[PDB]
Every structure is written in C-alpha cells, then in structure tokens.
Amino acid sequence: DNSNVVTMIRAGSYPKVNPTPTWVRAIPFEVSVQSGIAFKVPVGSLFSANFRTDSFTSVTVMSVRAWTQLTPPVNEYSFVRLKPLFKTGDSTEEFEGRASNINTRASVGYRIPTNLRQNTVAADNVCEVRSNCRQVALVISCCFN
Amino acid sequence: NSNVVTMIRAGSYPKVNPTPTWVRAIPFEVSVQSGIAFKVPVGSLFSANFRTDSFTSVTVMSVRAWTQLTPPVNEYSFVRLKPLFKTGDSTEEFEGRASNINTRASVGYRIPTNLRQNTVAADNVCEVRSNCRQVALVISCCFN
Amino acid sequence: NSNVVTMIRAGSYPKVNPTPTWVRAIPFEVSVQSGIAFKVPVGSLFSANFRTDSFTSVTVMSVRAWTQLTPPVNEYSFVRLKPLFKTGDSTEEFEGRASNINTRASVGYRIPTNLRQNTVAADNVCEVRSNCRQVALVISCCFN
Amino acid sequence: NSNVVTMIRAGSYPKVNPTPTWVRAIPFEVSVQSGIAFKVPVGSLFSANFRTDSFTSVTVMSVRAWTQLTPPVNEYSFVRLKPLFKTGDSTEEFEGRASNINTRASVGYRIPTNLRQNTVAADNVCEVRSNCRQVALVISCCFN
Amino acid sequence: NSNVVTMIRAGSYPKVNPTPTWVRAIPFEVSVQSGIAFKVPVGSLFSANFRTDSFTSVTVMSVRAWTQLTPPVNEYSFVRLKPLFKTGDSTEEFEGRASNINTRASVGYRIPTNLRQNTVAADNVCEVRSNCRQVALVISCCFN
Amino acid sequence: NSNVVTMIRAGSYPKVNPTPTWVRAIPFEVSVQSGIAFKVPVGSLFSANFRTDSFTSVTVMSVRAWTQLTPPVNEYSFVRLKPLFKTGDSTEEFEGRASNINTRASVGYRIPTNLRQNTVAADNVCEVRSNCRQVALVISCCFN
Amino acid sequence: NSNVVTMIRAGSYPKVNPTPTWVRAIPFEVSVQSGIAFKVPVGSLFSANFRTDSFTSVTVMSVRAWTQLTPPVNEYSFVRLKPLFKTGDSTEEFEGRASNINTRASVGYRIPTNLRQNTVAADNVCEVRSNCRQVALVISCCFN
RNA sequence: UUUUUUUUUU
RNA sequence: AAAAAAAAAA
RNA sequence: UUUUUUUUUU
RNA sequence: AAAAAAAAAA
RNA sequence: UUUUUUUUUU
RNA sequence: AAAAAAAAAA
RNA sequence: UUUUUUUUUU
RNA sequence: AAAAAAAAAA
RNA sequence: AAAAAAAAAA
RNA sequence: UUUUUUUUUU
RNA sequence: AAAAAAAAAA
RNA sequence: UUUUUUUUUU
RNA sequence: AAAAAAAAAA
RNA sequence: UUUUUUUUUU
Ligand SMILES: [Cl-]
Ligand SMILES: [Cl-]
Ligand SMILES: [Cl-]
Ligand SMILES: [Cl-]
Ligand SMILES: [Cl-]
Ligand SMILES: [Mg+2]
Ligand SMILES: [Mg+2]
Ligand SMILES: [Mg+2]
C-alpha cells in the first residue's frame, strides 16, 4: 500500500445496493456414464453449497466443456460426446473429442450463442453426455442469477 | 455474431476451484442506543441473505455507515465509526453530521493494506455511535 | 421553403404495415403491502390509457421504480425489484433508498439482450417490495 | 456483452407521457365511381386496425394514391388528387396515369409546413378521381 | 498445382462432429384461403426434400414470401405475414402488393437476435394471408 | 441492434435450390485385419448418421487416418493408405507410425484437383493397412 | 517491495523532540442564548477528548461555525462570529443564514498572519450569536 | 526461407 | 548503477 | 530482462 | 479511465 | 492485452 | 453525440 | 447518410 | 493472415 | 495541483 | 525534490 | 527468372 | 466491399 | 447572388 | 446542379 493507517472516507448519500448479486462462474463437477447410453446432465447439479451457489434458483449457461474422468475400456482410446439440449428445442449435434494416447483424457466443449443464452432451473437438463469411460468431468461456464 | 452452437477445441483439464473468493459490498443495519457504542460483529457478514453463508472468513477493505432512522427532536443526525482490530483497536472516531434534519448523516473509513487480514464470526469490525436508533452499513470486503 | 402543395412523383406501391411495433416508456403505479412482495403483471402494459390495447405481446428492456407515497414515520423510503423470467426467476433484489425522508427512493434494472423475449398479459415482469404503499414504475419496452 | 440483469442507478422521477404522439404512414382503400369525386374522410385514419383509435386529431403531411383494381377495357389506369383544406380548398388535380394497362397509376402531393394543422374525423383530406373502382392510399401523418 | 496424390503429415486425432448445424434458405409453398390466416408449421422445414429430415429443431432468422398463383379477377396480388413466437405472438401484418396484375406480390420480415431461439415441428412460424391460393416461402434459418 | 421484427423489402423471387451441396469432414471407423488391405467403401459416407443419406455422389478431397485401437504387444502402431481411383489405382503406401506404444499412428493424403471427381456407393476410396484392428478416418469431401 | 525486515545503516544520533507541534481541526459545540453573545474560551481546545491536553498554547488560524440545533418556529437559522484578540477586539459580525429552515447556517473567518500569535486557556477566541441554542465550531489551529 | 536427384516453362 | 548467490516474474 | 533477500563493487 | 476478485478471449 | 460480472478509485 | 423502433429525404 | 416522432446511452 | 463450398449485405 | 506541521526518502 | 499522516487552499 | 512432383534445411 | 453456419491452409 | 412556385435540362 | 417564366429577398 502507501498509507499505514486508517483514513476517513467522505461518504455521501446512500448508494444503490443489492444483497443478492449475480455471479459468473466455472463450475466443476462429475457425472456417471453408461456404455452406449446418453446421460442427461441436470442443471440442478449447479446449485449446491459445494459451489457456494445454493442460494440461486436460475443460471444462464454460456459454455460446456467435458473431460473423461476414468480410464477407457481395454484397447480403446477415450472419447466423449456432447449434445446440447434446449427447452425451445433440442440439438442433434454430437461434438466429440478423442484421446490420441490411451492414458490421456478425451475432451470437447461447445459454446451457446447469445440468442440461446436464457435461464435454466434445476429440473432442466443442459446436455447429453456419451463416453466409453464410466465418469466424465464437466466444467460449465455460467451466470448465476 | 453466432446464432447456433459451435465446437470448443478444449485441451487438458484446467486448474479448477469450486469454492472461490468473492469481492462484495454488503448492506445491513444495526441497532444503536443513545450514548452507547455498538460493536459490529463480523458474523453479520456470513448469511444466506448475502449468498455468503459458505464463508467463514472475510477481509474487510472499507466501512461506510449512514443513519437509518430520523434523529431526536431539534437535532441533526450524526454517526461515528471507531475501527477495531485484533492486533489493537483504534481510538479514531470518524464522524459525519447531517446539515438538513431530514437527511442521513454518513461517514466511512478505509483499512490500509497492511491491516487487511481476515476476521471471523466472533470478531468485531468497528464501533458505531449515533443519535439515531438505527444505522445502515455498506461494508466492502473480500470473502475467502 | 414551399408555401403550397407540391406534386409527389410516386412510383410502385410500397411495402406497408398497418400494425407496426412501438418503443415506449410506460408509467403506471402499483400498490405494495408491508413485508410482502407484489408481482407486477405484464397485462398492465396493454391499455387504451397508453394507446397499447391493440398489442398482445411486449419485449421489456428495462424497469425503473420510485416510491409513490410517503414512508412510515421515522423511516426513509426504500424500494426493491426482483426480476422475473419465464425461463427462470432471478434472486437479485436491486434496492434503492432515500437519503432525505421527504424524497422518493428509486432503482431499476436492465434486461440483457439474451433475455429480451416476449411476455403476455398473464406473465409478470418483476416483484416489488417497499415500505411505501404505492410504487411508480416506468418500463421501457417494445410493443409488437 | 452482458448476459445478466444489471442495476440502473435511477435518480429523480422523470417527465412522462402515457399517451404520446406517433408519426405514421397509414394504408387504406376507398371506393371510387366513374366520373365522380370521392372525398376521403380523415375519420378513416382513426381505427383499431391501425392502432390509432385512441387519437382524435392528426396532422397530415403527404398523400400518395394508387389505383387498386384494373381499369376499364381498352384503357390505362389514372388517378387524380385534389387537396382539401379547412381554410380553403385547392383546385389542383395532381394526376398520374399508367403506361402499361396491367400496371397501377400513382400520384401524390406534399402539404407545406404552413398548412400542416390538425384535422378531425369529420374533416376530409382530399378528393379522389379515377377510372378504377378502388384506390389505395398511403397517408404520411402525425397522430397527436 | 499438383497433379498427383501427396502425403499429409497428420497429427493427433482432431475434434469431430458427425451431425453439424447447417445455415439454409428453404423454399416451400403453402395453400391459402380467401380471408383466412394460414399458420405456417415449422414441421415443413424438416424433410428429406431439403436434406433436413435428420434435424428436429431450427432457428429461423428471416422469412420472405411471394404469391405463387395469379390473383382474383380485377385485383393485384397481395401477401401479408404476421410473426408468431412461443413467448408471445405479434400483431404486425407486413404486407406487399403487386403493381402489375401479372406480377407476384412479395414481402418478408427479419427476426431480431433476441428472438432467435429454437422451434420444433409442432410450432408455427407465422401466419400468411393473401388473395392468391398459394404462397411461396423462402425461410432463412439455422438447422441444429 | 434491433430488438423487434423488422420489414424486409423483398423483390422478385430468387434462384433457389432445396438440395444444395455440402463440404464435410466425415469421421467413421473401419475394421482391419492383420496383413490384409481393407477397401474403404464410399457408401460409408452416405448415412443418416452424417445427415448425408440424401446424397448419392461425393467428391473426396483428402483422407486422414488414425489407428483406433492399441497395437499388438511389443509393437508400435502403424497405418498405411493406398489411394484408389476408378481411372486407375495408385500404388503409393503413405504410412505413419507411432513413436509411443500408447499413441495413435496417423497419416493421410491429398487428392489433386485433376483427380477430384465423383464417387458412388459401390466405389472404394482407398486401401487401409494397419497392425491395429480398427482405423478411424476423417475424409474431407464435397457431397453433391 | 520487501517482505522481510531490512537493516538500517544508522548514523549519528539525530535531533529529537518528544513534544512536537500539531496542526489540527478541532470540532466542539457551545451553548448559545437568545440575543446574548457567548465568548468561546480558548481553553476548550486543550482536552483529552482531542489528544491535546499536553498543550498549554495554540495558534488559531481560522474559525468556522454551524448551527447545531433547529431554529425557532417560522425562522431560518443564523449565526454570527465576532473575532476577539488580546491586543484589541474586533467589531465585525460575520454572519450566515440558512435558506432552508431544515438546514444549518454557517460562516467563518480567517485570522491574518500578522494576528496569528498564541492564546492560552483564559483567552477567548470569538463571540457567537445565533437563534439556535447550540452552535457547532470547527477551529483550524496549530498547537505548540 | 531454399541447395542436390527424376519431369514441364523462362 | 552493474554483477554473483537464493527466490519470484517474463 | 525487472524486482525481493544475502554479498560486492561504485 | 485504470486497478483488484470470478469468467472468457488472445 | 480487450470484454462481461462484483468491487474501487476518478 | 451515437444507436434502436415509426416516418421522410438522399 | 441527414432530419422529424418515440426510446436509450452519454 | 491470404482461400474456397452453401446463407444475412455492399 | 501547491503550500504549512510531524515522519520517511534523496 | 517525491511519498505517508494532520491541515489548508483549488 | 517465376512453377510444380518426390529428398538434405529455415 | 464482408459478418454468422457445414469442410481444407496461415 | 440565393431561395419558393410552373417549365426544361442533367 | 444550370438556365427560362412569375415572385421574393439582397
Ligand atoms: Cl419538512
Ligand atoms: Cl409497502
Ligand atoms: Cl397480359
Ligand atoms: Cl438425414
Ligand atoms: Cl457578538
Ligand atoms: Mg438529520
Ligand atoms: Mg416515498
Ligand atoms: Mg434553518
């Protein structure tokens, strides 16, 4: 700093305030996945004391990134796929990443365009995950509000 | 700009942190008695009402205070703040007064970098004095 | 400039629209109860009082509110707004307070582009809370 | 850009008008008889079909006219407009004719600033003449 | 340039996507009845005739329409488009009219970024009105 | 930018095409045996799995291949590509090998402009050889 | 910057002074009677409440006064200051008045350098008059 | 960014 | 102000 | 290449 | 307009 | 280093 | 002063 | 690209 | 950063 | 932004 | 001559 | 002298 | 003259 | 010399 | 934007 002591603040009128502000975050959590089966990721996973977010009931997802979290079947390279879901209409895209070393995580993500950045609630789902690994690690960039 | 979803060519798993810090300005009110100093508890800053009930510590940067109820008859509002610190309390009484009886009095103080350590629930931030029965505080702090 | 009517060399019949959109700033009041939130209905925006009874949808852009009646004795006015959305309600409580007991408290919020969709009469714009029994709203919107 | 709601630091209650003015180009049709002049009523401009039924006055700025049905056999379409004014009618007959028997005739006139006052429902805008049994009008006007 | 096959020094397996999105202008015709509005189904956009039967959603960006058959005797063609939205229908009636009885009438409208969300087969895009029995549509959209 | 629908002043009906071409990178896997070349069928590129079942021809531009499973014990992965053409098969064997037993081998070839003609389902793109039982291909092609 | 204690290569013993001077702005209140002048004693400035009780002399530089209680019914606040000096009292009456009944009246005077000598407890600074029962003074001075 | 060895121009 | 040792940064 | 700690030279 | 905290991009 | 959110300073 | 919606002009 | 009306930002 | 194949402009 | 008092540095 | 603390002027 | 198709560099 | 959505280079 | 109305020209 | 007729201003 520069000053070593407390100093006076010449405050004025009472300002605009908000005890319950929004928060831009990158939320990491894991999901279980079955062979050949798509898992619908619930938005509700994003509201939790583990993320300091149990006071929010809505969130605007901006991007989803996914990594395989456990090793793949014998002889195989990891893969993970993401299909975006939207209350106005689900996508059929299957964004996919594959490992090129059997010992390394597969990764992929997608970005949601501005015109599709609306709120989701716990009962909603973000996307479908497919993998040859039994767990997938997600990092979701979103705006809690 | 984009109208549909686009692929992100992600790389390796990044460094992550589910429980990050948060820079905040927290507004709450305290009751104040005539001629008596109210010690503002830090525990008042951890609350679901602030989305902060997951924190147990906080680094306070500055405190601002405004009178919240009308003053006694014939008087102009005033408010004073005395900084408190675990390593030693101050004796400064930063004070503001209203120049119109219908208007809030206000004052604040900034904590220097060398004195910005953490406080926990059982600690007190500062003492508030006023001729008004309530004071509104806006505390700028770093939750961690 | 010309003082008489003058010929217009018109061409082909142009594109027309008898019922166009309309960007508006709509002022209306709501009643508020002590300690209770009031859900502001979007239907209040369609009315011959605003020249908008022909519309059935509206895209809200921003919401501003002021206290409309005096506050309780010894108090300063306050007003809070909580945005509501059909895709998910928010939990922000944007708040303004008066610093003079004789003056209105005010505050507003802007809706981001990505949240500007249509609402109809049965939908609600936001929740209002105040220590005053009436609040005056000015809503910037696009009737379509 | 912003993806979330944001606070507006509103101030004093602003100047407001629930019933503003509106500049428009209104499209409507009139029936016209052979060799007879039809007086276009200003009242055709106040209608829920144009979202204007809350207005009772209007300042007309210009008038454009198009034939709306096919002309008699062997003929090219024509349309004439004579401006009418409450302070004294004009004797101009602005006219356009088609050069292709299958194409609309069209003509228009602009009102000068010094003659742009209000008209009410009982007033008339202009006289229309044509060899076609309907004429389509687009009137640029200021509803107030 | 090259006349033979040449080696490509490939690296690691890339990010892939077997079922990507597609920006398209889809031409199809609807049948229209005199004096009755026809609701255009989004389902008409998903067909093997457009290479699009693998999609179940689409983001519509703009809609253009042309009359597809001759108008009634005496008349010039016209077409009207009223936008429909799941969050709230509009009341605009964008209209174009022919100025030669032998020529198509045309008109269209653009959807703003804030109203560009997905629609499925059970949804409707817009209403169509016309004095012609068929209307040709060209819809700009993003299949996803 | 605009927040509401706007009129488009459409003109004459445009050139249209409901079934346009499509430049693609198609990922699919083929099974490979030890010491044997596998002829890659062009028909694998036409599939609802790729949104391409409406196509019956395709112009291949380049072929890239990766081993898709682990190699035999003690060995590093390798994959070879021999281009095939209806006017005459090549005898090149473009080859990649892994330098880490745990990593994919990769290689590809580019087709020159003079050899970029259409292929149909019964045609074959190339021969694939490898010491791994599966090979992942990404073929750059133009569906038409 | 450094994070650890560092050595100071001290030199000879410096000049020291355990009881230095202090430039201050001292705030205190005095009681005032109707139509009677109150002599502000200099002794009020040497108080443990100001950290100044070790001083027995002070050099006054400027005096400012605000009314501290509300005025009589129907009146606006006023306050007057008459400077007093040991070598000769002044007859000036610097005066301020409120222009809002709810607001303080304020005024001050500056002492010129030629009249900036020391004063002790038994000396008086100035005479205060006001229609309010209390006046709040802020005195800029140099304790020595 | 260009040298040597199989084929086309300056 | 430069250099050497430990550390941090780029 | 800058800064911090120890050292040194100036 | 700059800086700090979270995020995104480069 | 630019933007978005929270904060702060101006 | 720029921008968005309606209009008018170019 | 300028202006008029409604809105917004400054 | 120059370049293509399909869409909203100039 | 300068100056006066206490302090620190040069 | 720069900064920190109190003050003052702007 | 600009240019390709295969190899030793930047 | 170039922005968004399917594929190749920098 | 500019502007408004009618006309002609570009 | 020039010129011609009527008008006006200068
Ligand atoms: Cl009052
Ligand atoms: Cl209330
Ligand atoms: Cl014909
Ligand atoms: Cl398909
Ligand atoms: Cl006196
Ligand atoms: Mg007061
Ligand atoms: Mg009020
Ligand atoms: Mg007074």
UniProtKB/Swiss-Prot annotation, chain A:
Miscellaneous section: This virus depends on tobacco mosaic virus for its replication.
Organism: Satellite tobacco mosaic virus
Keyword line: Capsid protein, Virion
GO MF terms, alphabetically ordered: structural molecule activity
GO cellular component: viral capsid
Keyword Coiled coil: no
Broad class of the protein's primary localization: virion
Name listed for the protein in its UniProt record: Coat protein
Compartments (UniProt record): Virion
